[PDB]
């Protein structure tokens with residue numbers, strides 16, 4: 001019984017796809033093995049530990065019933081991009097929603113303000129040292145690497 005809830009469709013649909021994929025049997029029930037069948041077919045995660053981690057965190061589990069479907073419903077979320085991928089991206093995402101782990105020079109210092117690091121001529125100065133890219137160059141995974149790896153500061 002819905003109650004005026006738009007919500008995303010791209011993900012909501014994905015779950016149904018993978019769900020009916022293995023549930024095609026039409027048994028009406030779901031086991032702990034079926035939930036992994038999907039990820040095992042496409043190879044989403046490396047080991048069941050991943051899916052089991054999030055799922056287990058949900059609450060509890062058993063042998064087989066039907067509620068197992070939650071695995072997919074949450075999978076679409078747990079699988080989504082988050083701080084888990086990058087630390088810096090986390091601070092940016094807080095302000096710049098468009099943040100996708102990489103942005104130009106404009107958005108770079110734009111979302112940076114969120115991280116509370118104050119990326120000045122210094123930050124960029126070194127960026128061209130390790131990353132080997134000028135200030136007029138968008139940042140990427142490699143960028144966060146040379147940064148997180150650098151490990152510097154001067155505020156305390």
Ligand SMILES: [Ca+2]
Pocket residue numbers: 022023024025026027028029030034
């Ligand atoms: Ca089934």
Ligand SMILES: [Ca+2]
Pocket residue numbers: 096098099100102103107
């Ligand atoms: Ca962006």
